[PDB]
Amino acid sequence: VQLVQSGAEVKKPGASVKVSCKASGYTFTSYAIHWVRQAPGQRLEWMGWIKAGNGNTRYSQKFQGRVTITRDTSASTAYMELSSLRSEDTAGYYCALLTVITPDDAFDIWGQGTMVTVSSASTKGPSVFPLAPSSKSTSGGTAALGCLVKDYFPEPVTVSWNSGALTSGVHTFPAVLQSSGLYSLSSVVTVPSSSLGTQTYICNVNHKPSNTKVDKKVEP
Amino acid sequence: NPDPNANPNVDPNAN
Amino acid sequence: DIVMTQSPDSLAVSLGERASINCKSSQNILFSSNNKNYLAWYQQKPGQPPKLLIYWASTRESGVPDRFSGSGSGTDFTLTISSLQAEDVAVYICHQYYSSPLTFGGGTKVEIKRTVAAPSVFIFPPSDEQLKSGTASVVCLLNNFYPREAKVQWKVDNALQSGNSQESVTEQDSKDSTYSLSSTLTLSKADYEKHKVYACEVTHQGLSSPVTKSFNR
């Protein structure tokens, strides 16, 4: 059972967004799909649900005017639309199979969630710069290296290392909003300094909104 | 009394 | 609407110690007919969807470790972690499905309390790829320290700096329960060349005096 959601987007205030959510691994018509939003520094907010069989819905009052939830049973997908977007609506959005307590089983599945940023500003792909290991970046028997992801909008960026073969010691830091209204973040890892000549370290970065994919190899 | 339509996924007779 | 209220907002205990999270319902959510409380407990790690742990207020979701358990009836409920592991650092959220709309608690943040670790400090001069694009970014890294409080200062030709840097801190590492810090000093290439010595100085409780890390352009 899996729910995979659509990519991050920026929308101008007063405009409309429509997040998709594809379901797989079960009889799509059998269960109700929920949508919950999570806004920074705010609790989880249930927005509404839709029965994927007959397309019946039930919405929350706090969003009843501007929210629309629909399913395309042929494509096993549910959709949620907010209209008259404002700044409060910059937040992460999730489709979820909340507490399916069936006789036989009990489970709770969520999509990866999708962040929507409401802003006048436009989508900008990131620049990726290495943080190369050097004498200034080795302490003990261990060296530090990473990647600088600079000047992107909107959030988020994902960073993996060596295609996900390297996780121990990895710190991807939270993004930071610079003065220009562009985001910048940094990802680092700690490795044994002795093996800098024989190991290979590549950071893999995604900015879905601009369809950017860089793999950057960071060397001494 | 619970509203059973709060979450259609929940069967009250199920444990 | 049924309002879910959690206490405390934050908690920190030592590894192996017991943690207790109270959730109070603003309306009774026990159904006397089936004698079932319509409450769930969730866990949320950073950058991930919430994962369900308890439903019917006391039924563990299959797979979930036994050190988590739920209790309480009516309007008052507790989540119990009998022996906190370092991986249990997360936000915990109660949830009611008695009534529309479905509502969530505000969340409780559990943290780990552990021995002091001075940070290892690393400095990174701007890449030559960045320089030929026009801007220079200098990055200072504070790796795997504890507690969270940590001061970073930038110095350019030994002259203290302010309001040209930016910082961010990780969530607590789920394996060693430390934190890490990243600061960036950003200048135009033209000013970057005007100066020779670039330093970041790190105050942390684990260091008797501030540790400076510098390089020459």
Tab-separated table of all heavy atoms in Angstrom, chain C residues 19-23 41-42 53-54 57 68-71 77-81 92-93:
chain	number	residue	atom	x	y	z
C	19	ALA	N	9.168	8.381	29.765
C	19	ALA	CA	8.520	9.609	29.326
C	19	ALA	C	7.004	9.412	29.299
C	19	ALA	O	6.505	8.314	29.026
C	19	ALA	CB	9.036	10.058	27.964
C	20	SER	N	6.285	10.481	29.630
C	20	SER	CA	4.854	10.439	29.838
C	20	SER	C	4.263	11.674	29.182
C	20	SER	O	4.728	12.791	29.423
C	20	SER	CB	4.521	10.401	31.336
C	20	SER	OG	3.220	9.861	31.576
C	21	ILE	N	3.251	11.468	28.342
C	21	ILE	CA	2.626	12.540	27.581
C	21	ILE	C	1.138	12.490	27.865
C	21	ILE	O	0.500	11.453	27.646
C	21	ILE	CB	2.903	12.421	26.070
C	21	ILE	CG1	4.419	12.422	25.792
C	21	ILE	CG2	2.214	13.542	25.298
C	21	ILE	CD1	4.823	12.087	24.304
C	22	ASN	N	0.589	13.596	28.358
C	22	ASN	CA	-0.829	13.681	28.659
C	22	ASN	C	-1.554	14.356	27.506
C	22	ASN	O	-1.066	15.343	26.948
C	22	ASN	CB	-1.082	14.460	29.948
C	22	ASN	CG	-2.459	14.208	30.507
C	22	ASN	OD1	-3.398	14.977	30.264
C	22	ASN	ND2	-2.597	13.110	31.245
C	23	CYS	N	-2.705	13.801	27.136
C	23	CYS	CA	-3.612	14.436	26.196
C	23	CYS	C	-4.979	14.480	26.857
C	23	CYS	O	-5.421	13.487	27.446
C	23	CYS	CB	-3.661	13.689	24.850
C	23	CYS	SG	-4.808	14.356	23.566
C	41	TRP	N	-2.705	7.722	18.773
C	41	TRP	CA	-1.445	8.379	19.072
C	41	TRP	C	-0.542	8.257	17.862
C	41	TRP	O	-0.478	7.194	17.224
C	41	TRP	CB	-0.777	7.767	20.284
C	41	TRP	CG	-1.316	8.318	21.508
C	41	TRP	CD1	-2.211	7.732	22.321
C	41	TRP	CD2	-1.014	9.592	22.086
C	41	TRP	NE1	-2.496	8.547	23.389
C	41	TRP	CE2	-1.774	9.701	23.267
C	41	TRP	CE3	-0.167	10.644	21.731
C	41	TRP	CZ2	-1.717	10.821	24.101
C	41	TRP	CZ3	-0.115	11.762	22.559
C	41	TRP	CH2	-0.881	11.838	23.727
C	42	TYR	N	0.128	9.354	17.536
C	42	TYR	CA	1.024	9.413	16.394
C	42	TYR	C	2.414	9.851	16.842
C	42	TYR	O	2.582	10.438	17.921
C	42	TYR	CB	0.500	10.386	15.326
C	42	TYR	CG	-0.640	9.847	14.483
C	42	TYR	CD1	-1.957	9.985	14.891
C	42	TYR	CD2	-0.395	9.199	13.282
C	42	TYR	CE1	-2.998	9.490	14.125
C	42	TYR	CE2	-1.427	8.690	12.522
C	42	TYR	CZ	-2.723	8.839	12.950
C	42	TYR	OH	-3.745	8.355	12.181
C	53	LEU	N	0.903	5.032	16.046
C	53	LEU	CA	1.387	4.119	17.079
C	53	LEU	C	0.293	3.416	17.860
C	53	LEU	O	0.429	2.229	18.161
C	53	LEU	CB	2.272	4.858	18.080
C	53	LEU	CG	3.513	5.488	17.452
C	53	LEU	CD1	3.512	6.922	17.868
C	53	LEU	CD2	4.760	4.814	17.925
C	54	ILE	N	-0.764	4.122	18.249
C	54	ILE	CA	-1.798	3.543	19.093
C	54	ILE	C	-3.151	3.937	18.529
C	54	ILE	O	-3.329	5.047	18.026
C	54	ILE	CB	-1.678	4.023	20.557
C	54	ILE	CG1	-0.220	4.065	21.020
C	54	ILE	CG2	-2.527	3.148	21.473
C	54	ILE	CD1	0.332	2.738	21.448
C	57	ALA	N	-6.929	4.133	21.779
C	57	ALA	CA	-6.227	4.692	22.928
C	57	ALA	C	-5.247	3.717	23.582
C	57	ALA	O	-4.281	4.162	24.212
C	57	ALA	CB	-7.227	5.202	23.974
C	68	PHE	N	6.164	1.553	23.862
C	68	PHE	CA	5.066	2.507	23.732
C	68	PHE	C	3.773	1.860	24.205
C	68	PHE	O	3.465	0.731	23.814
C	68	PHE	CB	4.880	2.961	22.284
C	68	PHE	CG	6.096	3.582	21.679
C	68	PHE	CD1	7.032	2.806	21.037
C	68	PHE	CD2	6.287	4.947	21.734
C	68	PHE	CE1	8.137	3.371	20.481
C	68	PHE	CE2	7.398	5.526	21.170
C	68	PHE	CZ	8.326	4.737	20.553
C	69	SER	N	3.011	2.572	25.033
C	69	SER	CA	1.683	2.094	25.393
C	69	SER	C	0.774	3.278	25.713
C	69	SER	O	1.233	4.335	26.155
C	69	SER	CB	1.737	1.128	26.578
C	69	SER	OG	1.936	1.837	27.778
C	70	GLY	N	-0.529	3.080	25.489
C	70	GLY	CA	-1.517	4.106	25.763
C	70	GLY	C	-2.524	3.741	26.845
C	70	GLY	O	-2.755	2.557	27.126
C	71	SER	N	-3.137	4.761	27.447
C	71	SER	CA	-3.960	4.607	28.644
C	71	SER	C	-4.824	5.850	28.782
C	71	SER	O	-4.582	6.865	28.124
C	71	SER	CB	-3.102	4.403	29.893
C	71	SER	OG	-2.218	5.506	30.051
C	77	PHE	N	-6.025	11.123	28.773
C	77	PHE	CA	-5.244	10.079	28.124
C	77	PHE	C	-3.749	10.337	28.285
C	77	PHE	O	-3.290	11.486	28.313
C	77	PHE	CB	-5.589	9.988	26.643
C	77	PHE	CG	-7.054	9.750	26.381
C	77	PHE	CD1	-7.863	10.764	25.910
C	77	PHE	CD2	-7.616	8.505	26.606
C	77	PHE	CE1	-9.228	10.531	25.647
C	77	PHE	CE2	-8.967	8.264	26.355
C	77	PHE	CZ	-9.770	9.282	25.874
C	78	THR	N	-2.990	9.243	28.366
C	78	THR	CA	-1.544	9.299	28.448
C	78	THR	C	-0.898	8.364	27.432
C	78	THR	O	-1.330	7.221	27.258
C	78	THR	CB	-1.066	8.932	29.837
C	78	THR	OG1	-1.612	9.865	30.772
C	78	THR	CG2	0.460	9.005	29.910
C	79	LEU	N	0.159	8.859	26.787
C	79	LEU	CA	1.111	8.025	26.065
C	79	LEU	C	2.345	7.795	26.929
C	79	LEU	O	2.899	8.743	27.498
C	79	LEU	CB	1.512	8.664	24.736
C	79	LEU	CG	2.521	7.830	23.946
C	79	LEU	CD1	1.926	6.466	23.571
C	79	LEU	CD2	3.001	8.575	22.714
C	80	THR	N	2.779	6.542	27.017
C	80	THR	CA	3.903	6.159	27.849
C	80	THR	C	4.999	5.503	27.020
C	80	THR	O	4.736	4.531	26.303
C	80	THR	CB	3.456	5.201	28.933
C	80	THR	OG1	2.578	5.888	29.845
C	80	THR	CG2	4.668	4.688	29.666
C	81	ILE	N	6.227	6.033	27.133
C	81	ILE	CA	7.430	5.418	26.587
C	81	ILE	C	8.224	4.925	27.786
C	81	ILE	O	8.764	5.733	28.552
C	81	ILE	CB	8.261	6.411	25.764
C	81	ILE	CG1	7.641	6.648	24.392
C	81	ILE	CG2	9.625	5.854	25.511
C	81	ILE	CD1	7.725	8.097	23.952
C	92	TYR	N	5.121	13.894	19.220
C	92	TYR	CA	4.050	12.923	19.407
C	92	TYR	C	2.717	13.661	19.415
C	92	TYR	O	2.595	14.710	20.054
C	92	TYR	CB	4.242	12.115	20.694
C	92	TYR	CG	5.426	11.214	20.580
C	92	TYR	CD1	6.709	11.734	20.721
C	92	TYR	CD2	5.285	9.862	20.271
C	92	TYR	CE1	7.815	10.941	20.573
C	92	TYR	CE2	6.407	9.038	20.131
C	92	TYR	CZ	7.673	9.605	20.277
C	92	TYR	OH	8.819	8.859	20.147
C	93	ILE	N	1.733	13.111	18.698
C	93	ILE	CA	0.466	13.788	18.430
C	93	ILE	C	-0.698	12.850	18.745
C	93	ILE	O	-0.791	11.758	18.170
C	93	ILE	CB	0.355	14.250	16.966
C	93	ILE	CG1	1.518	15.157	16.556
C	93	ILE	CG2	-0.994	14.908	16.732
C	93	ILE	CD1	1.950	14.935	15.078
